[PDB]
Design a protein around this nucleic acid. Structure first.
Lengths: 46, 72, 50, 150
RNA sequence: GAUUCACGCAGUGUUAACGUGCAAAUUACUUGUCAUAUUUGAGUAUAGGGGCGAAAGACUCAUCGAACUAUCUAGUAGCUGG
RNA sequence: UGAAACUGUCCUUAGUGCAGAUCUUGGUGGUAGUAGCAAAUACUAAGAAGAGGAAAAAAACAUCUUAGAACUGAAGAGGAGAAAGGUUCCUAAACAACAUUACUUGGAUUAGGGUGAAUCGAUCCUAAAUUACAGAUGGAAAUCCUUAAGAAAAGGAUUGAAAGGGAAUAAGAUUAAUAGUUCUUAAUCAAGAGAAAUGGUAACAUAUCAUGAACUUUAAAAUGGAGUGUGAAAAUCUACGGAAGAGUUCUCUUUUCUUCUUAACAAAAGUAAAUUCCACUGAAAUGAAUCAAUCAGAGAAGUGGAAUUUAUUGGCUUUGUAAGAAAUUCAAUGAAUUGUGGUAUUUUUGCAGUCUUCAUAAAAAUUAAAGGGAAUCUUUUGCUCGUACUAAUAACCGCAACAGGUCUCCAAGAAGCAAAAUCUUUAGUUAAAUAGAAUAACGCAGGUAAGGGAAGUCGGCAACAUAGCUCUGUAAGUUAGCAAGAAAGAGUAGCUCUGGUGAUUAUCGAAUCAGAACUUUAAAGGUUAGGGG
RNA sequence: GUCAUCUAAUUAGUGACGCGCAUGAAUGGAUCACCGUGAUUCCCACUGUCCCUAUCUGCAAUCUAGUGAAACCACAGUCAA
RNA sequence: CUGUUGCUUAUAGACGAUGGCAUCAGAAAUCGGUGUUGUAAGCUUUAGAGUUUCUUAAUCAAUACUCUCGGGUAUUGAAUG
């Protein structure tokens, strides 16, 4: 609902080229569901 | 409540269009026209209402036949 | 109202017919000052009182 | 574009509300050409316009509470909010009881257990609130009969 | 023409809000009342020294200890202003 | 600068000189980019269209679709009418102005389209009341009279209701918008055209039958309210049996949800409740019956009959209409299914008796019957007018898209005594006088607080406090009816069980009451909900 | 007003007294049971009314983008005598 | 040099201002410390008052035992790396 959000959220954002203009980029934030947040650090997904 | 609130029920016409003068002055319950003095045979005219005379009288309309006769 | 007399309905129709602007060709006449109809009205602006 | 006309026309054809109408978001150009009910009827056949299912409203919780109330699991003193006469009307209890007792008396008279004279006496006793229930009347009738035969 | 709740309605209090307002009298809570002396729609009747009033000089189109509108009328002013 | 009239002197004439009149009319400042653009819970992501989200976060972005999250909560922010409005209705193009920002949106601009009736209403009848010729009155305008005054009208003239009376139509489909109005199918009504009957003891009964004038009478149209019981239909709930589809499914769930329908008008397999009458008989040892009553020798109860009412024929199931429609699925137009019940609740509609009035709770048009005996199936047509839309937190009245006001119909689940508060389904909407950041004072709205407890104050103003149901208990005073829910005290949860209250003749069914072990965070209190003396 | 009572304390309330400025009998006199969004006093309970203020939330106010009035105004705006 | 700007910056603050750092900058996770509440979800204790179907097998069952000093939260204006 509008009155509550999860205490911690794990997301993954990817920088991708804009289809129209080749020069510019855009960020796509996606949601990564995890069972527990213990021992998770900032990982560069490749 | 003599001001804004009391004007809610104003949805019953008192005067409707008259048949001899065409104005919305025919009193429904009184069965008379307040302006041209309907069924009364004579047109209702008063000397205190000098303006009401110059608003509807001879020469304020088409004068369909009288214009021919006087010019004749 | 949904219910109306025949004569009253026709007088309603004329008021609809008279609520029109000046045709374009009449506006191009030489020495023409009649550009807009100042007798115009709209339902939500002035009640025609009939 | 504005698919307001197609949203309204689809509901009229599908006989639902505008809330249940589904318009394909990928086929906006196709639906936009549909400006008539005949065209809309063609789109439904092609499944571009779909009638959404009604929201599910389950009575499982209500049913399982009724069975608990049948066994008396929730009919306590802290769960009653109306008066005794409100919950069980006293007049209707008398109406039911009068029908029950008078039915039995009529059955005994026509069967032959009791004659008209003793039936008449028991009729006024019943009306006078002498017997609590059906059981109380049968022993009272049985007692009177054996006294008569004694 | 008993006691209460509800749909509604009123206007006891906060002398609360607002007071160049949502509103030329309204809003919130509290209070009262909520079918027979009840509530209510349409039709109809009663007109200004008149009507109507379970009576407050109250109401009679935001106008009432005498409505609105026009004529007498540029009413008169030993009084104020220019 | 301006581009066509004007000036100097003498007499004459006057609408002849402005800083004020809260002067009149018009225009314009400071205040001032200030006060404001804060009731109605609320928006977010992706995409489309567009000049109209750009960017060193310019943190906000109108319309449409999808998804998420929500509100009105079925006495509605739903679906429709009366009045009032009058084209605001539908569509397309277009956004200069208007809806306190903006708008590609609009109840705003421009141009087109749109209202179909023999059966719905007006039209017909009369109510309160209203208005004529003649007559009477008046100086006059005019007033009175409404059948009394009349050489007028068998008997009394006009108007007065889109809520009173009233001949006759329904289901499905169709339009961008009209539909008891159009189309398909199926009906109904009115006006027209082609010495005179039987049956039953009786109440009374017979696809038109089976004659019935003048005149007269009776009835219908056409009659308050309250409360109780009950018949039937619909909705909701539920029992058994299924068919199709959908949701959940690593934890379970033979699972949870949806569909399983039927009109006007007629028919008469089967079968009801209530009331009133008819025949046989004659009741006391008085009986018959209702929740209550109430009834009987001017005749009870019993048995056998007749009639009327129960949303059209004749009330319900059933039948024709009619499954060929419609609903739910499946395949790519064609295929499948469409049982039977309930001693449950509400609503609607009738019926039966009871209570109440110093209240007795309309008329006519129009129809039928009687008393009397004067006379000797097919087919045609059905005219005039209204019909769009809102009916309101944006179409009505208040200067307006104003938190004010304005008459009605239909009405799901939970929980509860309750149409109460609170939450949800069908439907509607997420916008309704702009937002973003920061989180000072002073506010408006909602709160809490140690110890004390009205010492504050004109005054317990405001707020706190009591609050449902069951049981025990209840004073003085009194018009003997009341006070009284007086006051005061105890109980209340969850789970596992036990017993009482019936129907039918072993099977089935109802929520209601009482009682007992065990457990815990020890129980009306989320909401609703008396402070007492 | 005087005497009692209510309180620690009573121009308040209640019960009495009465030569009552100027009460009094359908201008109705005396009496009160039930009733009252009527006026007045006292108890219990409860509490931010108060000792004596602290603190929490929403909407504003503050700043900004867009939009944007009004009352008022002789000229104006530091004091003492 | 100074100001703007950045740390959605603090020992500051209505806005300005004031204070600190600005590539050995900053920000964020995670980990440890430190707090708050009271023993997570799944399975097991004739647990468990009793019931049913069996015919000592199961099933239902408020609550309750061990795993569990557990689980969850913890700067947002907390302290380390």
């Amino acid at each position: 609902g509008i009155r509550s959000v999860a205490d911690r959220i794990r997301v993954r954002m990817a920088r991708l080229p804009i289809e129209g203009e080749e020069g510019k980029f855009y960020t796509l934030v996606s949601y990564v569901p995890v069972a527990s947040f213990k021992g998770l650090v900032t990982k560069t997904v490749e | 409540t003599k001001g804004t609130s009391c004007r809610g029920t104003r949805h019953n016409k008192t005067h409707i269009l008259c048949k001899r003068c065409g104005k919305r002055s025919w009193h429904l319950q009184k069965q008379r026209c307040a302006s041209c003095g309907y069924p009364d045979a004579k047109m209702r005219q008063y000397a205190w209402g000098y303006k009401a005379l110059r608003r509807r009288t001879q020469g304020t309309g088409r004068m369909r036949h009288l214009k021919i006769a006087l010019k004749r | 109202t949904g219910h109306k007399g025949f004569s009253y309905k026709l007088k309603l129709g004329k008021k609809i017919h008279q609520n029109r602007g000046v045709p374009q060709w009449f506006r191009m006449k030489t020495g023409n000052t009649i550009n807009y109809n100042f007798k115009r009205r709209h339902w939500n602006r002035r009640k025609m009182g009939m | 574009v504005s698919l307001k006309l197609q949203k309204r026309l689809a509901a009229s054809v599908l006989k639902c509300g505008n809330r249940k109408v589904w318009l394909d978001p990928n086929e906006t150009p196709e639906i936009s050409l549909a400006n008539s009910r005949k065209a809309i009827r063609k789109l439904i056949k092609d499944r571009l316009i779909i009638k959404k299912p009604a929201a599910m409203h389950s009575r499982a919780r209500v049913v399982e509470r009724k069975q608990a109330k049948i066994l008396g699991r929730h009919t306590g003193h802290g769960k009653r909010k109306g008066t005794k006469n409100a919950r069980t009307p006293q007049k209707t209890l008398w109406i039911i009881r009068m029908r029950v007792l008078r039915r039995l008396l009529l059955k005994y008279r026509t069967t032959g257990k009791i004659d008209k004279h003793m039936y008449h006496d028991f009729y006024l006793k019943v009306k006078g609130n002498q017997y609590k229930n059906k059981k109380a009347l049968m022993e009272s009738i049985f007692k009177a009969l054996e006294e008569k035969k004694l």
